[PDB]
Design a protein around this ligand. Structure first.
Ligand SMILES: *[C@@H]1O[C@H](CO[C@@H]2O[C@@H](C)[C@@H](O)[C@@H](O)[C@@H]2O)[C@@H](O[C@@H]2O[C@H](CO)[C@@H](O)[C@H](O)[C@H]2NC(C)=O)[C@H](O)[C@H]1NC(C)=O
Ligand SMILES: *[C@@H]1O[C@H](CO)[C@@H](O[C@@H]2O[C@H](CO)[C@@H](O)[C@H](O)[C@H]2NC(C)=O)[C@H](O)[C@H]1NC(C)=O
Ligand SMILES: *[C@@H]1O[C@H](CO)[C@@H](O)[C@H](O)[C@H]1NC(C)=O
Ligand SMILES: *[C@@H]1O[C@H](CO)[C@@H](O)[C@H](O)[C@H]1NC(C)=O
Ligand SMILES: *[C@@H]1O[C@H](CO)[C@@H](O)[C@H](O)[C@H]1NC(C)=O
Ligand SMILES: *[C@@H]1O[C@H](CO)[C@@H](O)[C@H](O)[C@H]1NC(C)=O
Ligand SMILES: *[C@@H]1O[C@H](CO)[C@@H](O)[C@H](O)[C@H]1NC(C)=O
Ligand SMILES: *[C@@H]1O[C@H](CO)[C@@H](O)[C@H](O)[C@H]1NC(C)=O
Ligand SMILES: *[C@@H]1O[C@H](CO)[C@@H](O)[C@H](O)[C@H]1NC(C)=O
Ligand SMILES: *[C@@H]1O[C@H](CO)[C@@H](O)[C@H](O)[C@H]1NC(C)=O
Lengths: 431, 270, 488, 49
């Protein structure tokens, strides 16, 4: 019942102009300050005036730097499946018409209608946000899915299948799935410039490319909580959830160093790290769902705290929505189909028995590699080639009908299979 | 007899899944077999090879990439590896759902070296699983115990130097395979207090330290976490005046000090 | 039923990285007398969290394994299963989780030296060895565990060495009664103290460098001596503090033990403050930054001393060792990195440093143990500090000259600013030229004083610098800066 | 390269060893993995003195 009815002082110290601007007579500890210049840094201290006019001391200045100017929208998701679009304060709430499932994760957007998200039980769901009667190629939800990502350039949806320990690449327009040889991965991000798939296990974080020379391991350990990929600045952040210490790192895509270790019993949601683009900031949602933590890359020691709105009171996902639209599917990375008339089995002298075809090209001139299948009756021979050339070693000599299947591929996707049947030439010497 | 039913149920579900999803995945060579070939290019023959090789890889500690190694599809036979990994996680899910009630109904018992006797046994494929962790908790989160030595009947022996005069609770974490979400937790032990030994390792944290007027100085404090024994006294050094205050009092007020100047208090724990 | 016994063993060899291995020992299960001795297949899988570290399958009658390349401050879980080899039947299974922590963990092995031999007694397996059969009985015994070298003094007062695989070679023959013995393990210097028979009695500290030993008998060098009327006991060399701590008592008052010593670089006398007079001094942790002495007061009370803080340190092994009595902890007291050994009533008692408890008590024959030496962890410098330096520099400083001679000073060399300790076994090879006139192969620490020089004539010295480890590794010799020395 | 075929002549046995036929626009340049003999590690690295 002791009374401390005080009026507080909040100063604004701009570092760009060296100007001290101070207001008076605020009654509560909460204050909503308005009318700041964007893309600017400020220093803030607080003291408190009593009834008699004697103020308290200054505090330490906090490095407070503004969000840049723009319609900068945050997409909140509940644990009950409601989607609320706020701006960067947690104000300006718009309740979206879509209804997600229980405990949804980060929604990965394919075009402006169709998105893919992974719930808390491991199921992967598709939702058409605009017209829900059509747009999803997979009819039922798919179990044991770790995360999901999308390549805009290849036009392929990538998810980690936790049951198979594989990464499944899917066409969003047809639902055709491909097993990729990426093992024990939990989270995915693909670089669209070069086609490299970056993946993080529970133990390690590494890279998968179109050749085995392009596999670079960046980290080896607690466990990796999430990771994001910075395509523009050529760098790579991840969250390691250890023994009571949430620690974030940075490595280039080609110095591995520690940015901030957050100590406490509270930790982050797996797949909740996000790169905020206009600050160069890193966000993660907390496990209790009532708090989103933000660190700036310029100032590592300042860890900002974003409270969650009351309408979505436990949160399970938060994205900064990109203000540009997503770019469409590139037809410059699609490999052209190998012509079936150009697949010859023109042989040389001695033991040079080989199959040549016209080389498949793409629109933008990318490296087209080939996978070839042979059928000598029951005999099978599979070759992974980088040239339009395949030497036949085990030729059975007895004038067979050979079935040849050329599949062109790039680093982003694969072309259509060309299936031909060719009569083998007569082989007189056998030595 | 329950184990061979679990083996045959996982093998039945594996061959039934490789019958089902044979049209679902586009292969890298463009295979597209029909439903009745039984040829080596197709999804169903490599996938049933994966359901043939899942148990032999588990009991001989082989990976599914090393068990499903072929000279036709190299370096990775992906239906074979996928069927092996799906059958191994279905097997460890069925063992966890088999033994979940027996894990969560059986309480470990502490006796006193410090010995936990749990009324369980090691699994049949003990080396194929992850190592079990004994977990400790202060009574007044669960952290992993660093030093213990158990035999196959779970008669453990804690070799970790615990904090003296600290109430502890212990439990068993049982992982099942390499899946990190498939862990079983035993119930906690009855709470055991370590016998008291040694100097305290935690300083007592003060609550409020201010002056009363120009000739008195007040302090309130609470005892620390690891007090290492029965608490007897708190020594207060003001810089000098050094007083002895017993364990019941947590507030002392100094006197006969100089007006308007800057001091330093040193508080210890005895 | 027997349990699995895992020990963390850290072994450091000079010019090599310190490796950490786990010695896994497990006895066989109990078999009947009708069956013979059965081969048991021991499947050991070692895990770090959720990843497999090493996997071992061994066919043995009883388990004796080593899992190499462990990392310090890391939790390793050892899943060991035992199966009978012929039948496949399960004999037993054990699960040992182990924080590594190598400053407080070792294998319980001591070195004992009776009148017949020097042997190793493992206190875990209770098995006795013989390292060297001595013709004459051992009085003092020290060791260098990085090269398995035992240095000892017999009753015929002679200093001998023993590498495994070779005969005992005499390093020195000594003409007085030896009070104590110690070794600098980094610089390979063996320090001992000899009695003086002058009626004020003192103890003269001798030294001998083991890098100058090429197979013939060397002689010691007097470097320090005691103030007269006082005597030495219990020489302990600390290399990382560069100290040589003894116990200096007075003749006629052996229970007035005071801790003195010298600094090993400049020879300055160092003093250590004890709250009570002493009787005997034993070495402790031998770890850089945390060096320890186990010194005994005159009441039969151990203090676990700290060298850097110059004060007593309270431990839980201090109360348990004081209950053994004065004759046990001042009889023989040995301490490795993991255990702390004492002999009471014909039984050697290992007290563990980590758990602060009595761990092993091994009964003895009444004349088995006269001395007790533990394999304490001799921490070595890195390979930049032990070897030859990179830059030559102006190491030879020109002194003030007379007309006849110039006293050239020959100092010790640290390899860089990151290396605090001197380079072991430094030998200069020098010639003198008139700006050869002389050829000297002289070590570091002494002076070359250079007679028969012409007055008002400049002279020039030139030198190469040779160390012990650069001759062993066949590394090429540094040529230092040829400096010119003027005579007036 | 002679008449759309690359001819390897062995240096040890002094004979023609391999003749491999080509497509007419496969080879414009021809570079071989000749043995690039390196100095020892004292010569490549930093000096002592
Ligand atoms: C460990 O030993 C087993 C069994 O050893 C066999 O039985 C003993 C009594 C003795 O007579 C041995 O010489 C026998 O080999 C080994 O298992 C055998 O392994 C070989 C080689 O792979 C194989 O041909 C045999 O069929 C196996 N025999 C049996 C009975 O299982 C095993 O390999 C040994 N392990 C290691 C790591 O050496
Ligand atoms: C976004 O892409 C999806 C395909 O991923 C489109 O959905 C198709 O829409 C047409 C027209 O409504 C239907 O006939 C198809 O059946 C849908 N495809 C599938 C696979 O179901 C969708 O129209 C696209 N949205 C926009 C705005 O372009
Ligand atoms: C690709 O190659 C063709 C033919 O060589 C050329 O005309 C074109 O400029 C190249 N680039 C793109 C981006 O199409
Ligand atoms: C470990 O160190 C010892 C002593 O230096 C040596 O004999 C042994 O070969 C080492 N073992 C390794 C590197 O596996
Ligand atoms: C023990 O020696 C110290 C230091 O020489 C001296 O002051 C002291 O008198 C001695 N005590 C006795 C009882 O001789
Ligand atoms: C010994 O002398 C050296 C060099 O002067 C100095 O660095 C060191 O501190 C001294 N050691 C002790 C223990 O005083
Ligand atoms: C001490 O040793 C003797 C040896 O005969 C033995 O009889 C005696 O029991 C021992 N005392 C104790 C207390 O163990
Ligand atoms: C060497 O010269 C020094 C100069 O101090 C002198 O002490 C010493 O006696 C000389 N030694 C010999 C052997 O002449
Ligand atoms: C000294 O001179 C002799 C004779 O030329 C030569 O063998 C030796 O290498 C020289 N040593 C130095 C250090 O210059
Ligand atoms: C040279 O090449 C042509 C290519 O058509 C071929 O017809 C001809 O036989 C070749 N000549 C010789 C001598 O091999």
């Amino acid at each position: 019942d002791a009374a401390r009815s005080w009026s507080y002082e909040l100063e604004v110290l701009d570092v760009a102009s060296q100007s001290a601007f101070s207001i008076r007579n605020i009654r509560g500890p909460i204050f909503g300050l308005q009318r700041l210049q964007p893309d600017n840094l400020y220093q803030l201290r607080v003291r408190a005036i009593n009834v008699d006019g004697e103020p308290g001391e200054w505090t330490e200045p906090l490095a407070a730097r503004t969000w840049p100017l723009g319609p900068h929208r945050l997409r909140w998701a509940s644990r009950q499946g409601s989607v609320i679009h706020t701006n960067e304060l947690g104000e300006g709430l718009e309740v979206q018409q879509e209804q997600l499932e229980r405990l949804p994760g980060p929604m990965t957007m394919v075009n402006e209608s169709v998105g893919y998200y992974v719930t808390g039980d491991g199921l992967l769901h598709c939702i058409n946000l605009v017209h829900s009667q059509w747009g999803c190629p997979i009819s039922e939800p798919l179990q044991h899915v770790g995360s999901v990502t999308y390549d805009w350039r290849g036009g392929r949806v990538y998810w980690t299948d936790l049951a198979r320990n594989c990464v499944v690449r899917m066409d969003p327009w047809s639902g055709s799935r491909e097993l990729l040889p990426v093992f024990e991965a939990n989270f995915l991000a693909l670089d669209p410039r070069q086609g490299h798939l970056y993946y993080a296990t529970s133990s390690q974080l590494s890279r998968h490319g179109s050749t085995p020379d392009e596999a670079v391991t960046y980290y080896r350990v607690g466990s990796i909580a999430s990771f994001v990929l910075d395509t523009q600045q050529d760098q790579l952040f991840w969250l390691v959830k250890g023994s009571g210490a949430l620690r974030l790192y940075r490595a280039p895509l080609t110095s591995l160093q520690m940015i901030q270790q957050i100590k406490g019993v509270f930790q982050a949601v797996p797949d909740s790290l996000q790169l905020l683009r206009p600050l160069g900031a890193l966000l993660w949602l907390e496990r209790s769902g009532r708090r989103a933590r933000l660190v700036r890359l310029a100032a590592p020691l300042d860890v900002m705290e974003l409270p969650t709105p009351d309408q979505a009171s436990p949160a399970s996902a938060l994205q900064l929505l990109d203000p540009q639209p997503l770019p469409p599917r590139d037809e410059g990375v699609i490999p052209m189909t190998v012509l079936p008339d150009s697949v010859r089995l023109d042989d040389g002298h001695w033991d040079d028995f080989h199959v040549r075809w016209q080389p498949s090209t793409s629109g933008g001139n990318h490296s087209v590699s080939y996978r070839l299948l042979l059928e000598f009756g029951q005999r099978l021979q599979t070759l992974d080639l980088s040239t339009p050339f395949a030497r036949l070693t085990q030729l059975p000599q007895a004038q067979l009908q050979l079935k040849i299947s050329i599949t062109p591929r790039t680093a982003w996707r694969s072309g259509d299979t060309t299936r031909v049947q060719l009569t083998t030439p007569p082989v007189a010497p056998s030595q | 007899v329950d184990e061979r039913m679990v083996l045959e149920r996982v093998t039945r579900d594996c061959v039934q899944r490789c019958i089902v999803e044979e049209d679902l995945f586009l292969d890298e060579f463009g295979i597209q077999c029909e439903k009745a070939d039984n040829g080596e290019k197709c999804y169903k023959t490599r996938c049933t090879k994966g359901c043939a090789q899942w148990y032999r890889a588990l009991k001989e500690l082989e990976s599914c990439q090393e068990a499903c190694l072929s000279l036709q599809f190299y370096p990775y036979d992906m239906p074979c590896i996928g069927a092996c990994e799906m059958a191994q996680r279905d097997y460890w899910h069925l063992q966890r759902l088999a033994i979940s009630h027996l894990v969560e109904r059986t309480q470990p018992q502490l006796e006193r070296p410090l010995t936990i006797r749990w009324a369980m046994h090691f699994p049949e494929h003990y080396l194929a699983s992850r190592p079990f962790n004994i977990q400790y908790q202060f009574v007044d989160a669960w952290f992993n115990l660093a030093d213990y030595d158990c035999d196959e009947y779970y008669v453990c022996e804690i070799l970790e130097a615990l904090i003296p005069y600290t109430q502890y609770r212990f439990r068993f974490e049982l992982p099942f395979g390499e899946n990190r979400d498939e862990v079983l937790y035993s119930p906690a032990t009855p709470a055991y207090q370590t016998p008291p030994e040694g100097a305290p390792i935690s300083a007592p944290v003060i609550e409020h330290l201010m002056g009363l007027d120009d000739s008195h100085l007040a302090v309130h404090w609470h005892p620390g976490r690891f007090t290492n024994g029965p608490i007897e006294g708190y020594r207060l050094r003001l810089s000098t005046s050094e007083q002895l205050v017993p364990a019941g009092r947590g507030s002392y007020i100094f006197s006969q000090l100089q007006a308007g100047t800057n001091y330093t208090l040193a508080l210890s724990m005895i | 039923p027997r349990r699995l016994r895992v020990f963390v063993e850290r072994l450091a060899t000079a010019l090599q990285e310190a490796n950490v291995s786990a010695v896994l020992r497990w006895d066989a299960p109990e078999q009947g007398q009708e069956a013979p001795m059965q081969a048991l297949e021991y499947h050991i899988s070692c895990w770090v969290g959720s990843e497999l570290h090493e996997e071992l399958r061994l066919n043995q009658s009883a388990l004796e394994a080593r899992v190499e390349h462990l990392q310090p401050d890391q939790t390793y879980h050892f899943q060991v299963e035992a199966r009978v080899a012929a039948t496949g039947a399960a004999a037993g299974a054990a699960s040992h989780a182990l924080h590594v922590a190598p400053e407080v963990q070792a294998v319980p092995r001591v070195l004992y030296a009776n009148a017949e031999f020097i042997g190793e007694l493992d206190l875990d397996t209770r098995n006795r060895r013989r390292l060297v059969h001595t013709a004459s009985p051992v009085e003092h015994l020290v060791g260098i565990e990085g090269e398995q070298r035992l240095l000892w003094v017999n009753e015929h007062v002679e200093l001998l060495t023993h590498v495994p695989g070779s005969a005992p070679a005499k390093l020195a023959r000594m003409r007085a009664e030896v009070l104590a013995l110690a070794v600098d393990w980094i610089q390979r210097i063996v320090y001992w103290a000899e009695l003086d028979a002058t009626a004020p009695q003192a103890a003269i500290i001798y030294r001998l460098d083991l890098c100058n030993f090429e197979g013939k008998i060397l002689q010691g060098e007097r470097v320090w001596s005691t103030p007269r009327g006082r005597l030495l006991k219990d020489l302990v060399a600390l290399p990382q503090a560069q100290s040589l701590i003894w116990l200096e008592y007075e003749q006629g008052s052996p229970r007035n033990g005071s801790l003195r010593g010298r600094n090993l670089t400049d020879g300055s006398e160092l003093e250590w403050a004890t709250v009570q007079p002493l009787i005997r001094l034993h070495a402790g942790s031998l770890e850089p930054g945390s060096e320890t002495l186990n010194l005994v007061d005159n009441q039969g009370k151990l203090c676990v001393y700290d060298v850097a803080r110059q004060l007593c340190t309270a431990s839980a092994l201090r109360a348990q060792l004081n209950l053994l009595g004065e004759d046990s902890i001042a009889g023989q007291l040995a301490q490795d990195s993991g255990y702390l050994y004492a002999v009471k009533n014909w039984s050697i008692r290992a007290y563990g440093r980590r758990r602060q408890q009595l761990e092993y008590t091994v009964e003895l024959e009444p004349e088995e143990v006269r001395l007790l030496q533990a394999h304490n962890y001799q921490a070595y410098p890195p390979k930049n500090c032990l070897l030859l330096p990179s830059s030559g520099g102006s190491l030879l400083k020109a002194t003030d000259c007379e007309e006849q001679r110039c006293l050239l000073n020959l100092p010790m060399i640290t390899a860089s600013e990151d290396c605090p300790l001197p380079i072991p076994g430094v030998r200069y090879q020098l010639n003198l030229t008139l700006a050869p006139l002389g050829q000297w192969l002289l070590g570091a620490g002494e002076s070359l004083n250079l007679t028969d020089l012409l007055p008002f004539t400049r002279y020039r010295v030139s030198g190469i610098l040779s160390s012990f480890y650069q001759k062993k590794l066949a590394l090429p010799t540094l040529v230092l800066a040829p400096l010119e020395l003027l005579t007036a």
